[PDB]
């Protein structure tokens, strides 16, 4: 979430200071629109992770209703964000690429 | 000679400055085309304009006047 990505992923950082996500402290991965692949993707998610994304999500709802945001300090640390799913997810990308693959076969 | 901002203030009101300017451009064109022969233009634009001011102040007075 840093200057190129604070301009660009600073649509998610400076301009999600504007578009909100990361300054809202969101989870990058969490932003993926729910899809089936996304669905079972999460089904396979890691546990401690699952809790984490949970608290994140709920909180997001919380301030959302509150229509407030955390301290800009509390606003999320830029860059410095594990790509949570992306190993798991992207793995699934290969999966549905595989079901998709022999499927093509 | 009933009180007639129509007539009455049309003296008083239409003495207006801007009104007079439109009168300048006005009779100006009046003679302008007037000189011409075999021409289609009646130059209504001015008459319209002067009227527009005449009203502009007019109801801004006449009603307040009129009873």
């Amino acid at each position: 979430v840093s200057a190129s990505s604070k301009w660009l992923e600073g649509i998610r950082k400076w301009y999600y200071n504007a578009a909100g996500f990361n300054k809202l402290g969101l989870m990058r991965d969490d932003t993926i629109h729910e899809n089936d692949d996304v669905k079972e993707a999460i089904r396979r998610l890691p546990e401690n992770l699952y809790d984490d994304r949970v608290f994140r999500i709920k909180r997001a709802l919380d301030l959302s209703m509150r229509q407030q945001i955390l301290p800009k300090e509390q606003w999320t640390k830029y860059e410095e964000d594990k790509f949570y799913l992306e190993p798991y997810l992207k793995e699934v990308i290969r999966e549905r690429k595989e079901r998709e693959e022999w499927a093509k076969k | 000679e009933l009180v007639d901002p129509l007539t009455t203030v049309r003296e008083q009101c239409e003495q207006l400055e801007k009104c007079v300017k439109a009168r300048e451009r006005l009779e100006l064109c009046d003679e302008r085309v007037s000189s011409r022969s075999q021409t289609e233009e009646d130059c209504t634009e001015e008459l319209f304009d002067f009227l527009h001011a005449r009203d502009h102040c007019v109801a801004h007075k006449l009603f307040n006047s009129l009873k």
């Binding site: 809790d51 949970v54 509150r66 | 007037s34 209504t44 009227l51 009203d55 109801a59």
Partner: protein
Amino acid sequence: SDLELHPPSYPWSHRGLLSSLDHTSIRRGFQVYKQVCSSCHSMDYVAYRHLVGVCYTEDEAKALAEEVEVQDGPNEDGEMFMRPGKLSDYFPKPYPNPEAARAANNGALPPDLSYIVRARHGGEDYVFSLLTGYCEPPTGVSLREGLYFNPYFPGQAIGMAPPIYNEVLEFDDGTPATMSQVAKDVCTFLRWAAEPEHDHRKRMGLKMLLMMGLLLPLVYAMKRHKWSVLKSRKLAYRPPK
């Protein structure tokens, strides 16, 4: 004449968000009917039984009708000869045939005024600005003379004298006479044909102003009253270890 006078705003006595009028000009509007206006005019949807409560009294309205020839229905009689007319009798406008208009002036459909304000376009000034704006053609133009000179108008040329200026002289209660209370009584008895509750309904709007101001807060309160707890909630993420 294709160049629209944006009719100036005559501070119409009703021109306020709520504001009122006088009538018997409309009687002289009826006498504009009887003379000026509805000689050539229809209000035709106009119905006398309406104005009953408006201006004249039970008798004054009564005779006001009876003062007119009904041209009654037939008694065995088809044909249908004349009567005095009732309150139930409407406001019996002019010459019947559409060609009676076409001839009346040359062509010149003399339309009904019933909605005319609310019908044609523009406001009281359409009477004041436009109609009272009967005026000489400036130049460069000649009608068939069928159109008189009314410069303020669609063609700037037709149709009308100021029977004020050349007085058919009536103020029954007495005054010098002007166009409004029969013009805006042709707007009123157009609105008194449309928005007489422009008074009555006006009244209700008042209470509305309060109801919301009361309820709207009370409502919003109630909403907060509900949602409040949810507002402040504390939910703990305390993952074990």
